[PDB]
């Protein structure tokens, strides 16, 4: 399973979104290198201008590419579920605003890792930080706390994303995560640990479509 | 589940590994199929730079499972009956007074996605012919695909001639010889004689810098 990740893996991502009735579709393509915990991806909104800020979509848009140091290999649920993959479900509570509910299927199809997701958002304020497009185009570093979920043969994750707002304030998004293996087969169930993340967002200056270029480094830690 | 996999909209992921007269290329397609209305909506990207052949010559190669079979013809839908394990689709395409394509594809589900992964080999094409010379119009005519059962090989065969408009007003013919065999083993539907009637419309994405083809297609089965 971790065998599928010894080198560079091409990635396809597709997000079917609905936020307060506003419908959008995003496609991403690029590559992940789990030996160094690196993701390089470009996303396009194929439906025109997004109704939500790009940074609110970052956590939704493949943690199998986290670098798990050698002494932590037995704790890497994400890779062990491959190639059949895992379902990743989240509820994201934007503080003083609406919620995202996401379901994604992450698997291999031949040589590509594929992440297909539907996202539904409700209860957002039309003049809030999200529909009012008031979030800075950057992304902070976080700790994704992972715990085993033996009942469901998977894992759970909890973490709070901090979104910088244009006026200097911070928009919190509380993430509640569950992953379940898709196929029957042994999976690694981890002890408590976290993923430490870093993300940098840029633009293609010759790209006229609404888009986000992303580079991300992730390392598992919290086990000495 | 056979036809049951096609009651809604189904995401598609196609891949074509091609070699024509030694000129190598790779095409990746994504989009959606809706077999209830016989609709295909796809976008193709040549990842290897400009194609050495015209896009319209690749159209038939790049999922007849999304053909609309009317209720009273459902018993003759081989393509859906082989799902999710899928079928191998092999073709020989004879371009009159020119070279030949030989193709082999596996069409199957990968989770939620219908996947069409193809190898194409082209030989004996003329340097200043309509194909290598890029003399074909960017469009696609409507055809009838005649399907017949193939008892021994537990599959089907199909025969038809594609008509490619040439820039000078002439017409380039391409005789298709097709065989489909199920991958699983794996009870399937062997149809009476009938046909697929097709319409295809080809377009461009004005913001896409890579060589590409946007495709919309309607196909309905008839003859019974
Ligand atoms: Cu897809």
């Amino acid at each position: 399973g971790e065998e599928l990740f010894t080198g560079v893996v091409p990635i396809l991502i597709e997000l079917d979104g609905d936020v307060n009735g506003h419908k959008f579709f995003v496609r991403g393509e690029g590559e992940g290198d789990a030996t160094i915990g690196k993701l390089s991806l470009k996303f396009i909104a194929t439906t025109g201008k997004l109704p939500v800020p790009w940074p609110t979509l970052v956590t939704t848009l493949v943690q199998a590419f986290s670098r798990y140091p050698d002494h932590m290999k037995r704790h890497d649920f994400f890779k062990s579920a491959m190639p059949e993959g895992y379902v990743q479900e989240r509820t994201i509570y934007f503080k003083d605003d609406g919620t995202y509910k996401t379901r994604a299927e992450v698997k291999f199809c031949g040589d590509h890792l594929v992440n297909r997701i539907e996202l539904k958002g409700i209860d957002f304020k039309e003049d809030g930080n999200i529909l009012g497009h008031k979030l800075e185009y950057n992304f902070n570093s976080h700790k994704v706390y992972i715990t085993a979920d033996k009942q469901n043969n998977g894992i759970k994750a909890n973490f709070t994303i901090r979104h910088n707002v244009e006026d200097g304030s911070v928009q919190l998004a509380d993430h509640y995560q569950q992953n379940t293996p898709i196929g029957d087969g042994p999976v690694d169930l981890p002890d408590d640990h976290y993923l430490s993340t870093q993300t940098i967002l840029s633009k293609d200056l010759n790209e006229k479509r609404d888009h986000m270029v992303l580079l991300e480094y992730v390392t598992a830690a919290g086990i000495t």
Side-chain angles (χ1 to χ4, degrees), chain A residues 3-17:
Chain A
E3 296 194 332
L4 298 166
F5 291 93
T6 52
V8 173
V9 176
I11 299 167
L12 306 166
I13 302 171
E14 319 165 2
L15 186 161
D16 187 10

Side-chain angles (χ1 to χ4, degrees), chain A residues 19-118:
Chain A
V19 169
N20 278 33
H22 305 287
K23 289 180 171 297
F24 57 100
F25 197 94
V26 171
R27 290 182 183 279
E29 75 182 278
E31 40 176 73
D33 187 346
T35 65
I36 57 171
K38 181 183 182 161
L39 296 177
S40 295
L41 296 156
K42 168 174 175 185
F43 303 91
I44 309 292
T46 60
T47 36
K49 194 172 193 55
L50 286 187
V52 303
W54 279 109
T56 72
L57 298 188
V58 164
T59 60
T60 296
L61 294 163
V62 283
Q63 286 166 324
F65 288 105
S66 310
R67 173 173 175 262
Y68 272 80
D70 281 340
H71 81 284
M72 287 181 76
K73 289 304 192 48
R74 73 185 194 72
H75 306 281
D76 190 346
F77 161 92
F78 299 108
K79 290 187 189 56
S80 68
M82 297 300 167
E84 286 173 310
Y86 55 79
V87 179
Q88 172 159 313
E89 301 178 291
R90 285 210 192 94
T91 305
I92 303 166
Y93 302 90
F94 294 88
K95 185 191 181 191
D96 294 310
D97 218 323
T99 60
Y100 289 165
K101 278 193 162 174
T102 69
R103 184 190 196 272
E105 297 201 0
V106 188
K107 63 207 199 292
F108 274 92
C109 297
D111 272 330
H112 327 261
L113 183 138
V114 176
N115 178 25
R116 169 149 184 282
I117 310 151
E118 53 199 340

